[PDB]
């Protein structure tokens, strides 16, 4: 009666059930087993050809093992053929299949990454022991440096040798005014971009002043002394150091004059630390301009600096000591001479996996591209379908060879048959890195079609062949012109432009399709000089019409007056007309530099030209501050994917900044390292990381420790998630602690820097506070002693969540976006307090999240304040819980914080379209600030099923919130408290709308990463509707209200 007695016959019940923890796999300490047995047998191969097998402990150093081996070898024959043990080193084959020599004999058996448990004894070849700490490099990298040396490809070899230009330059800037500049690299000043202060910050200062606390130590290394100043906000560290020394050294035994003289001898012996972490104030910015100060002002805190001896600082900086590595056709025939069309011979795909029943026939689709296509897309015939497919036909492309632009690319795809459907795909650069038009035969191993792409061809996809051999390899052949065809010099292109210009000046009275040429003269029409800036203001995703394109192209020379139009102009050039392109090259040559946030568009997939991308990098070189770079560093690392060649300007820009500023370097390493599993970028990012690692100085050794820590945690959780699943928390937690107590973990997980922030040191592990959270992903809650001198002044304990299992990079981006929305709001005076807690992907679905102390999910609020019997939870309990925390005048401020944070997180969320909010993913801190966690999919990715103009409200303010927002009324909809709130939401909504270009562009730049939520520009197009960019701002306000009203049902007009 329930199911009409209809049987499901296939259904049989002997990871939907327990639906969590998807990404795998990763092998640990020995091949095929995660953690080696505590006691283990290792064959030691001796130089006398004997195998003696020691039983060793898992945790034992090679010093211990050698020492025992050479005791135990005595008992075997041919002992008199051995030297003293000191004349030997251990070698073995590792899991990366390389024979590593083990130089550092303090290393433990579990930490060597052996393939099989065995150790060959040898006298050390390669007499530069020093040099073969390339092992250090390929640890940090996660692939051995020897794997690059045997790459044939000259581009790679050329990258490696030529990139050192950049390293050697950066290392020079460091040892320039040493030791100060070394300190400046290592400890660069953590500083807001603007010295100007928002209105609302200034007004916490009583007429621009701050009480501060400078601290000092005298003898031995114990007692400390405050010196509680009240300086001007905009006074530099040197001035602040004076006043600490003044007050420290005022006396009844010193005259006024005598004091001034004891100040000057002391004043520049010292520099300012931040108590509790390794941050420092080493250059003349206003105190207010350092981030720590400005935080302290907002949080209502008295800053706690420390007076530090420069020599006790310059003590701690070791020398960086850079070393150059071991790796140090007669003018051809110009592309413009070649008198033919392009034709490409498709030959034969080999490895095509298709059901001959299911699929009728298969062919090779093709196209020439430049982001968009410079000719009609063509296929070939549907020949030898499915069973062993082979077409030996020249495809014929209607474009002359000289009209191929520098950044031209072939994009192809094997398809199935309107039954049209892609199997594989792959793209090739028609020009190589040496500017050489491609000729002869090519093997191209193809990529599988990803999730979001239903399209036939995929040209945004990475240029180059798949490294995975066993995949559809479609080989092919390019025309030959008895010569290595090459792309013209700039000199040659300049002339052709200067000519093409003059030639336009004699074209005559009438031209139908004025379109591409002015016919205006030096005087343009005022209605049009208004229509151009009108175009310029529009966002990148408001596509341009052919009228508008031709129009922009005609007035290209006036477009120099309005530099910001450039992105639009460039997309109106016909890249299949070298006449037009050559002219554009001469504009871009001295086009006025533009704001980095506008220039960053020009390094997305829609601007593949080298000259354009150059200009962009030149913009960044001028304007983009070391502050603003490290914000957008994610998008800039991503955007490398769209560079045609290994060696380019963008790479050389970043690599240099990374070696110039150790704080950038830190995140640069991790962001590249993060994506090293992904074979689209493995080689490229590997090569780059090798450069950085080779040139970055001591930090390599620091990174190596952070890297060793993460690997241990990766292993530990991999066991908890496999074979310790279906065990009680009790049993798991017992396993966890047992393991963390072993000396190798104690070694590896204790003295290092948080990758979330290398300013924080991580000291000893407090295992009593380390635990596995209740999630099925088995995340670790880890806790470390802050081993600063002034732990107490900042935080005695540092705790961060390690989570093997989830792809942290969607979160990472939304949190970055929030970071930016906050900044935009605040720096244009209006205070909405977002809390972009720290996130960082360090792997393939492996990462770190910042713990925010003293905060709870609403659900805990309600579980705590919930009366027995369990009938219903009370709406007021949030409010009651919050009242219970903030009592007196403190209350009034806590509701302002709640209200200010709740409006920001309403607008941000609605705009971004993050996952529906509810009690287990919204959090409230004791001081009354609200913030979201676990955002899910960010651009409305559950609209990929159904969807269609849903324009959802993910943060729907239930009663709970509304009560709190209007102090404690009933019928909260009708208070000034809530009127004020609404007007925050409207001012916040419009503020983001005026910067909408940026947000589009940040998303545009992230298309690179294989995030399923960002497969193509239409994904990003949600953010248009939600911001209502096609409408007027007054309509947009009303739109936003309309949206906010219907999700709430009354309140908003």
């Amino acid at each position: 009666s329930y199911y009409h007695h209809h049987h499901h016959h296939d259904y049989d019940i002997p990871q939907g059930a327990m639906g969590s923890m998807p990404p795998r796999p990763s092998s640990g300490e020995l091949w095929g087993i995660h953690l080696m047995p505590p006691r283990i047998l290792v064959e030691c191969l001796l130089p006398n050809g004997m195998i003696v097998t020691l039983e060793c402990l898992r945790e034992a150093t090679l010093i211990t093992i050698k020492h025992e081996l050479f005791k135990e070898a005595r008992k075997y024959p041919l002992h008199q053929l051995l030297q003293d043990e000191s004349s030997y080193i251990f070698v073995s084959v590792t899991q990366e299949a390389e024979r590593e020599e083990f130089f550092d004999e303090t290393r433990r058996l579990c930490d060597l990454r052996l393939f099989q448990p065995f150790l060959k004894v040898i006298e050390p070849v390669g007499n530069r022991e020093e040099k073969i700490l390339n092992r250090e490099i390929g640890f940090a990298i996660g692939m051995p440096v020897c794997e690059f040396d045997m790459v044939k490809d000259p581009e790679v070899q050329d990258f490696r040798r030529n990139i050192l230009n950049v390293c050697k330059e950066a290392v020079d800037l460091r040892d320039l005014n040493s030791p100060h500049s070394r300190a400046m690299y290592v400890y660069p000043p953590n500083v807001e971009s603007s010295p100007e202060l928002p209105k609302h910050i200034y007004n916490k200062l009583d007429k621009g002043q701050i009480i501060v606390v400078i601290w000092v130590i005298v003898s031995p290394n114990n007692d400390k002394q405050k010196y509680t100043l009240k300086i001007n906000h905009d006074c530099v560290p040197e001035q602040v150091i004076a006043e600490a020394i003044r007050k420290k050294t005022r006396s009844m035994l010193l005259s006024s004059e005598q004091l001034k003289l004891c100040v000057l001898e002391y004043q520049g012996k010292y520099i300012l630390k931040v108590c509790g972490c390794d941050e420092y104030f080493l250059e003349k910015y206003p105190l207010s301009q350092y981030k720590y100060i400005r935080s302290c002002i907002m949080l209502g805190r008295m800053p706690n600096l420390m007076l530090m001896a420069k020599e006790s600082l310059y003590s701690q900086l070791p020398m960086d000591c850079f070393t150059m590595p071991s790796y140090s056709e007669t003018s051809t025939k110009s592309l413009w001479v070649i008198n033919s069309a392009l034709r490409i011979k498709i030959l034969c795909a080999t490895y095509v996996n298709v059901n001959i029943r299911d699929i009728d026939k298969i062919y090779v689709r093709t196209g020439i591209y430049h982001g968009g296509e410079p000719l009609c897309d063509n296929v070939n015939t549907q020949r030898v379908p499915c069973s062993n497919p082979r077409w030996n036909e020249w495809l014929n492309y209607d474009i002359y060879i000289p009209d191929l632009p520098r950044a031209a690319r072939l994009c192809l795809s094997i398809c199935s048959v309107e039954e049209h459907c892609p199997l594989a795909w792959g793209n090739i650069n028609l020009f190589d890195y040496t500017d050489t038009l491609v000729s002869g035969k090519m093997a191209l191993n193809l990529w599988p079609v990803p999730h979001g792409l239903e399209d036939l061809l995929n040209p945004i996809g990475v240029t180059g062949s798949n490294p995975n051999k066993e995949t559809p390899c479609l080989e092919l052949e390019f025309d030959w012109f008895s010569s290595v065809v090459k792309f013209p010099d700039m000199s040659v292109i300049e002339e052709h432009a200067n000519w093409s210009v003059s030639r336009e000046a004699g074209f005559s009275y009438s031209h139908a399709g004025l379109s591409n040429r002015l016919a205006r003269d030096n005087e343009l029409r005022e209605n049009d000089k208004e229509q151009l800036k009108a175009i310029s203001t529009r966002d990148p995703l408001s596509e341009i019409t052919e009228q508008e394109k031709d129009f922009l192209w005609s007035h290209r020379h006036y477009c120099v007056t309005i530099p910001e139009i450039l992105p639009k102009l460039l997309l109106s050039v016909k890249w299949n007309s070298r006449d037009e392109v050559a002219q554009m090259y001469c504009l871009v040559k001295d086009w006025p530099p533009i704001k980095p946030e506008q220039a960053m568009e020009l390094l997305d997939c829609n601007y593949p030209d080298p000259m354009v991308r150059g200009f962009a990098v030149r913009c960044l070189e001028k304007y983009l501050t070391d502050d603003k770079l490290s914000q957008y560093l994610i998008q800039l690392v991503q955007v490398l994917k769209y560079e045609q060649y290994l060696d380019n300007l963008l790479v050389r820009f970043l690599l240099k900044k990374a070696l110039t500023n150790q704080r950038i370097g830190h995140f640069f390493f991790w962001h590249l390292k993060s994506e090293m599993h992904n074979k689209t970028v493995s080689q490229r990012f590997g090569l780059l990381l090798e450069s950085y690692c080779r040139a970055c100085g001591m930090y390599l050794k620091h990174l190596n420790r952070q890297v060793e820590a993460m690997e241990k945690l990766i292993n530990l959780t991999d066991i908890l998630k496999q074979e310790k699943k279906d065990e009680t928390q009790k049993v798991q937690m017992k396993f966890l602690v047992e393991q963390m107590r072993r000396p190798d973990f104690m070694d590896a997980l204790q003295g290092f820097l948080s990758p979330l922030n290398p300013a924080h040191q991580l000291g000893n592990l407090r295992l009593e506070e380390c635990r596995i959270m209740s999630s099925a992903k088995r995340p670790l809650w880890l806790n470390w002693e802050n081993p600063d001198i002034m732990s107490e002044l900042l935080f005695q304990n540092n705790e961060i969540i390690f989570k093997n299992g989830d792809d942290l990079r969607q979160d990472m981006l939304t949190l970055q976006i929030i970071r930016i929305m906050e900044n935009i709001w605040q720096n244009q005076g209006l205070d909405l307090r977002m809390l972009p807690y720290g996130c960082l992907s360090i792997g393939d679905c492996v990462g770190l999240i910042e713990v925010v102390r003293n905060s709870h999910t609403i659900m805990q609020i309600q579980c705590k304040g919930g009366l027995k019997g369990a009938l219903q939870f009370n709406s007021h309990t949030l409010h009651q819980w919050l009242k219970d925390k903030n009592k007196g005048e403190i209350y009034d401020a806590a509701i302002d914080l709640f209200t200010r944070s709740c409006a920001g997180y309403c607008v941000a969320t609605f705009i971004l379209g993050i996952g529906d909010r509810h009690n287990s993913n919204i959090m409230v801190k004791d001081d009354g600030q609200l913030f979201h966690i676990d955002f899910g999919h960010f651009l409305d990715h559950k609209k990929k099923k159904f969807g269609y103009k849903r324009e959802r409200v993910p943060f729907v303010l239930t009663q709970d919130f509304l009560i709190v927002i209007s102090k404690g009324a009933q019928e909260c909809t009708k208070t000034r408290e809530f009127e004020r709130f609404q007007e925050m939401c409207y001012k916040a909504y419009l503020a983001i709308r005026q910067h909408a270009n940026l947000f589009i562009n940040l998303f545009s730049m992230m298309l690179g990463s294989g995030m399923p939520e960002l497969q193509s520009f239409d994904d990003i197009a949600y953010i248009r509707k939600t911001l209502a960019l096609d409408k007027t701002e007054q309509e947009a306000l009303e739109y936003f209200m309309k949206q906010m009203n219907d999700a709430h049902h009354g309140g908003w007009t």
Partner: protein
């Protein structure tokens, strides 16, 4: 008729109607101008803008202008294809004028679609794990081979030193010396035998893996074209209805 027009709809939802149609397909649509002819050409959408007349050259209406260019190419107006495919969903939806039963069909197809999208997602993970598992198998094979070399070298290494230490002193020790030297050697060589057997056993596993890998791609490719048509039909059924935006969500 100028409201109906067999294609006049009146940005984003244009592109998602122009998604995956052929080279020629078109339709017609903020103080910029009036209507916009969004014509698709080889994976990229071309937008053409529009006293009575509807750039320089006498066409009295919006329907006047598009019938002319359905016959003819657009090169003569602006240098760089025709309006061949006026694509715009009553043809095959079981012609159902039953407003409710078209809504039920939407759910059936949308449950099939969403079923199918998981099958496609599951398999894509198996594929990608299996790539990783395969290349980890391949690297191990090299590791084995390199391991073996070191032992093959080792059994060779002793033959030089051991058979220098048999002949120099044959009487001294003799079958006390050379027995316990031969024991070691016979450990060393059958150990090599075990290793080589271990490698072999991985290669046979690698082929069975590479076979399974082939089978996953095969079935991905057989799921894919159904996932498009099942999707495309759902969007035509869902378009026919909207010819009740909030009523849809429960079926969907």
């Amino acid at each position: 008729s100028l409201q109906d027009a067999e294609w006049y709809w009146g940005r984003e939802e244009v592109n998602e109607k122009l998604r995956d149609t052929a080279d020629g397909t078109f339709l017609v649509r903020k103080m910029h101008g009036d209507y916009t002819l969004t014509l698709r050409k080889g994976g990229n959408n071309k937008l053409i803008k529009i006293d009575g007349k509807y750039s320089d050259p006498t066409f009295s209406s919006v329907v006047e202008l598009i019938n002319h260019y359905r016959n003819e190419s657009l090169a003569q107006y602006n240098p760089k294809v025709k309006l061949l495919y006026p694509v715009s969903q009553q043809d095959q939806v079981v012609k159902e004028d039953n407003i409710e039963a078209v809504g039920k069909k939407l759910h059936e197809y949308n449950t099939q679609f969403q079923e199918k999208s998981r099958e496609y997602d599951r398999l894509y993970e198996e594929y990608t794990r299996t790539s990783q598992e395969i290349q980890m198998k391949r690297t191990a094979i090299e590791a084995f081979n390199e391991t073996i070399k070191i032992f093959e070298e080792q059994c060779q290494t002793q033959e030089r030193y051991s058979k220098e230490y048999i002949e120099k002193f044959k009487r001294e020790g003799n079958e006390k010396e050379i027995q316990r030297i031969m024991h070691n050697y016979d450990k060393l060589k059958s150990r090599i035998s075990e290793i080589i057997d271990s490698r072999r056993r991985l290669e046979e596993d690698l082929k069975k893996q590479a076979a399974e890998y082939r089978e996953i791609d095969k079935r991905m490719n057989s799921i894919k074209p159904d996932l498009i048509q099942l999707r495309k039909t759902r969007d035509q059924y869902l378009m026919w209805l909207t010819q009740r935006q909030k009523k849809l969500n429960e079926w969907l």
